[PDB]
């Protein structure tokens, strides 16, 4: 596992992990074993703690810290508390008669491990939320600490993303295969696969209506839509069985219409309209995101639909993915940092219709040099990426959370000369869901 000794290496702390996942019901407990020597503890006891520390920049740091967790393990049993776990008990396999363990628990609504990025000349201040398991030995809790008697680990809490999206992806690939198919066999196989995917998706529930009742009217409408979709798949499959491939392809093209019906109901969209004087008709703009939950590094494709009847041409399209970070503290300020920018010289004739799909990807390596970003750890570490979006409170408090991180996509249209019309699409970025010893030191 992982270990780390004090500057006076007479006190060694082990842990089963360095990163702990947040289950909304209950975070995993912290299991560890404390190895000491009673001779150096002639009249003294070893201590363990856990705090949700706050950092900035006696290191010239302002602090607003709130959590306490106490389990002392010398002797290990004042009372036989022992809510034991398998690895914690088995860790005595190689450890002698001084190794007494500990067990901790984290509240299920604490903020995750987020850290803002400062710099020599930064657009934002330095702040962060991080956890620490600190161990030490002295006569009592209130006694002054010392550096030759301390081990201070730093652990991390991570939220992982929560079937319908996979089913829709399968349907999209099967539809493309259907369009590109040339014989009846591939058509039939694709139709079978999409029928299975559509049924499986109909068995599921959408994220937006989760709080509503299972028998609520919205769920009825959703299942009705998937019923229509499966019926159209059935018609295409029957035509494919008859062998007439072209009619099957048209019946599959009808699935485009039913998918368009589903999208405007259950996917992020936005539409703003603007008009000017000395004209007759206004300008209309629309955009849509394919999905809501995104994975770090997964490209984001942004549909753009534009129509116009004005007397002005437009040759510019700008698509961006913008950071948004909150600081729920006394220094309250708000931030916005484009993580990925896009530019094309596409066409807006005075009277014409345009629709193309553009793909973007927020990535830290290309976007590193700017300051004030939102990260989840030290930049030097390999497991450090951008900050996953702060899952909003389920009606809980906001001030105590500290740092809220969110993402949304902007599409801008550059009005020609003789504001610039824009839409926004909120979305979500998240990470996808004997003993050998090692050192904890990062």
């Amino acid at each position: 596992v992982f270990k780390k000794a004090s500057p006076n290496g007479k006190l060694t702390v082990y842990l089963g992990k360095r990163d702990f996942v947040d289950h909304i019901d209950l975070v995993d407990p912290v299991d560890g074993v404390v190895l000491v020597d009673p001779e150096y503890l002639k009249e003294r006891r070893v201590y363990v703690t856990l705090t949700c520390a706050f950092r900035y920049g006696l290191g010239l740091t302002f602090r607003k810290d709130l959590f306490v967790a106490n389990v002392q393990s010398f002797p290990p049993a004042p009372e036989d508390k022992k809510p034991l776990t398998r690895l914690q008990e088995r860790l005595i396999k190689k450890l002698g008669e001084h190794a007494y363990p500990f067990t901790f628990e984290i509240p299920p609504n604490l903020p995750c491990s987020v850290t803002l990025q400062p710099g020599p000349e930064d657009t934002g201040k330095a702040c962060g939320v991080d956890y620490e398991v600190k161990a030490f030995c002295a006569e009592n809790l209130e006694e002054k600490i010392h550096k030759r008697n301390s081990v201070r680990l730093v652990i991390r809490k991570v939220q992982y993303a929560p079937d319908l999206e996979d089913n829709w992806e399968t349907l999209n690939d099967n539809l493309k295969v259907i369009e590109k198919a040339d014989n009846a066999a591939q058509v039939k196989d694709a139709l079978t696969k999409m029928r299975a995917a559509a049924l499986d998706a109909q068995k599921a529930t959408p994220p937006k209506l989760e709080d509503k009742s299972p028998d609520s009217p919205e769920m009825k409408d959703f299942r009705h839509g998937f019923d229509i979709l499966v019926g159209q798949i059935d018609d295409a499959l029957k035509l494919a069985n008859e062998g007439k491939v072209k009619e099957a392809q048209a019946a599959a093209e009808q699935l485009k219409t039913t998918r368009n019906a589903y999208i405007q109901k259950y996917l992020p969209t936005a539409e703003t309209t603007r008009q000017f004087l000395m004209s007759d008709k206004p300008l209309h703009l629309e955009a849509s995101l394919d999905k809501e939950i995104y994975y770090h590094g997964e490209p984001i494709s942004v549909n753009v639909h534009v129509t116009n009847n004005t007397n002005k041409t437009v040759k510019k399209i700008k698509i961006s993915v913008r950071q948004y970070a909150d600081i729920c503290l006394f220094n309250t300020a708000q931030y916005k940092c484009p993580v990925a920018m896009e530019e094309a010289d596409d066409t807006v004739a005075p009277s014409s219709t345009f629709c193309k799909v553009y793909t973007l990807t927020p990535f830290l390596a290309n976007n590193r040099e700017k300051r004030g970003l939102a990260l989840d750890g030290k930049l030097k570490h390999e497991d450090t990426n951008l900050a996953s979006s702060t899952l909003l409170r389920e009606g809980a408090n906001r001030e105590i959370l500290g740092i809220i991180v969110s993402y949304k996509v902007k599409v801008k249209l550059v009005v020609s000369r003789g504001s610039d019309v824009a839409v926004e699409l909120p979305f979500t970025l998240m990470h996808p869901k004997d003993i050998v010893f090692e050192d904890f030191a990062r």
Partner: antibody
Amino acid sequence: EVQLVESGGGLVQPGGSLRLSCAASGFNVVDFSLHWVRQAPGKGLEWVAYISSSSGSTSYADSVKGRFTISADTSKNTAYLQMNSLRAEDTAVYYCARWGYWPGEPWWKAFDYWGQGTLVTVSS
Amino acid sequence: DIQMTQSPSSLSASVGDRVTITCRASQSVSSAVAWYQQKPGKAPKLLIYSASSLYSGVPSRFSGSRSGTDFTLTISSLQPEDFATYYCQQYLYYSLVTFGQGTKVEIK
């Protein structure tokens, strides 16, 4: 009540023809689909063919693709199966089964009401 | 064609014991699996449809569970009617129906 009466079996020389009739009572054929499920003696069940009277669509099996012919009759609540050039492998007892339509529970309940079955035998 | 296979080709159990019968799909069929209990020389009977749901009339000591593409059935066997061959059918589409090789529950 629901009863799937299946009759029309017998012994036929190789290359001969037979007409297996599946009569239904207690429900009209215009509301459900009708299949055929084989059973070889001492083996598992096997799918044969089916018909749906709401669309006239029929599909057969890879073993009896070019030989059998299925046709329904709404006014009599019977769906006819036609045997042509029966081989030796078709010496199996045949069942008639009913399957609902897509929208709703009936599709999910696959083959809720079967038939007693008739036995056909092919020998030289 | 979607293929159905039953692994425990024969089971031996006595009255009152617990019996489990498995099935494994070769392709993703969202539920769409039904189990039939074929008595010696009798037509199949519908026990469990939708891969988990019960059919009215069938006794209550029958249940199923789906995990990925693997389907299982569980009984608390009684004397008269729980000793026969059981089957596993996939019914995704009208012209895609394939049955599984049966399994027999003898008496020790």
